[PDB]
Amino acid sequence: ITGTSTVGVGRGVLGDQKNINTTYSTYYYLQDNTRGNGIFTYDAKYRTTLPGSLWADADNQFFASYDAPAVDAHYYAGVTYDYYKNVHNRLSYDGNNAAIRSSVHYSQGYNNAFWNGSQMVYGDGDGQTFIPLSGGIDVVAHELTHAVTDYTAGLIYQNESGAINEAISDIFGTLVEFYANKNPDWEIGEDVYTPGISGDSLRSMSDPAKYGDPDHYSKRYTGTQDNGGVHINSGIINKAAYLISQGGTHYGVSVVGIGRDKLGKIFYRALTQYLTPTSNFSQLRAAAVQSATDLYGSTSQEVASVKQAFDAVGVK
Numbered sequence: 496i497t498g499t500s501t502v503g504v505g506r507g508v509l510g511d512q513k514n515i516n517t518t519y520s521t522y523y524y525l526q527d528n529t530r531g532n533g534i535f536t537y538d539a540k541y542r543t544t545l546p547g548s549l550w551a552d553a554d555n556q557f558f559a560s561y562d563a564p565a566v567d568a569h570y571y572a573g574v575t576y577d578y579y580k581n582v583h584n585r586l587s588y589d590g591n592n593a594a595i596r597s598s599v600h601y602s603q604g605y606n607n608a609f610w611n612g613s614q615m616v617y618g619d620g621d622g623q624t625f626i627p628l629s630g631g632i633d634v635v636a637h638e639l640t641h642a643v644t645d646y647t648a649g650l651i652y653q654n655e656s657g658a659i660n661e662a663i664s665d666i667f668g669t670l671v672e673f674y675a676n677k678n679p680d681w682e683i684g685e686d687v688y689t690p691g692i693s694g695d696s697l698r699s700m701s702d703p704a705k706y707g708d709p710d711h712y713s714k715r716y717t718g719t720q721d722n723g724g725v726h727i728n729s730g731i732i733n734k735a736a737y738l739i740s741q742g743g744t745h746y747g748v749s750v751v752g753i754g755r756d757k758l759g760k761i762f763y764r765a766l767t768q769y770l771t772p773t774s775n776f777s778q779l780r781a782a783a784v785q786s787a788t789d790l791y792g793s794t795s796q797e798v799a800s801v802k803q804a805f806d807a808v809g810v811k
């Protein structure tokens with residue numbers, strides 16, 4: 496809407512206070528005009544019709560329990576925008592400052608979040624498996640990264656291409672979590688998963704097998720569940736990315752880590768210059784090797800480490 500840019504304050508899903516960019520015109524709206532063509536957060540009001548109504552608040556204070564998922568969806572979308580702009584010189588998901596739209600309170604007891612082709616959508620969880628899913632910065636950045644992928648490589652959402660699509664979202668979701676530097680880790684969803692169980696998460700990048708996901712190509716899922724295992728076989732690529740950044744010896748193959756910032760540069764270049772809608776794992780290895788070569792040189796440690804990491808997970 497048309498109005499003047501303002502700064503509200505509220506509390507997120509985990510009870511942390513944060514400032515949020517709003518817009519005033521009669522009400523205060525969750526509309527951040529400081530980033531691109533705006534970040535807009537909507538109330539789906541427990542329904543499944545999208546987007547719902549642009550979030551409106553009478554006093555610019557967002558401390559009600561009902562407000563918390565909106566505060567975090569809005570704030571973490573901003574952090575993710577800042578990551579892509581400051582770290583990769585990318586302006587929003589399309590590279591042209593497209594407006595970023597999110598809806599919260601989607602459905603009833605909904606244990607998921609997604610990018611629907613046009614916007615991000617967050618359930619509240621059932622209170623046992625999940626709390627509201629926008630409480631996880633890695634979740635928010637994972638979802639916005641699906642938009643980045645769709646506008647760049649365009650990896651189709653099935654089989655190996657879809658597992659790459661998933662791993663890209665887990666990788667950048669994790670790199671955004673490190674960028675914000677609040678309790679960062681290589682786990683996915685730990686801040687919103689199972690409020691009754693400490694120390695778990697939905698997936699692990701450092702040890703995918705902790706939750707049953709494969710960490711080697713020989714262990715890949717070959718059936719039809721989960722669109723051909725997109726959230727399962729992503730573990731193979733997640734492990735490779737983790738090794739590239741942090742190093743390790745895995746199935747007897749030693750990898751010298753090169754750090755998160757270089758991991759991000761290599762995979763961002765692979766995503767935006769070399770991957771295609773039907774790329775498979777072997778083609779991702781080639782894309783990553785070429786990206787590291789472009790950035791660091793063919794004889795560089797960075798290139799050598801990319802090769803070792805894909806070797807360690809059995810991807811030639």
Ligand SMILES: NNC(=O)CCC(=O)O
Pocket residue numbers: 607608609610637638641652661
């Ligand atoms: N394809 N989308 C989903 O399965 C929702 C969760 C995710 O973002 O991966």
Ligand SMILES: [Ca+2]
Pocket residue numbers: 552553554555556557558
């Ligand atoms: Ca209020």
Ligand SMILES: [Ca+2]
Pocket residue numbers: 672677678679680685686
């Ligand atoms: Ca964390």
Ligand SMILES: [Ca+2]
Pocket residue numbers: 633669672679680681682683684685
């Ligand atoms: Ca995490």
Ligand SMILES: [Ca+2]
Pocket residue numbers: 685687688689690691692693694695696
């Ligand atoms: Ca938990």
Ligand SMILES: [Zn+2]
Pocket residue numbers: 637641661664
């Ligand atoms: Zn995903």
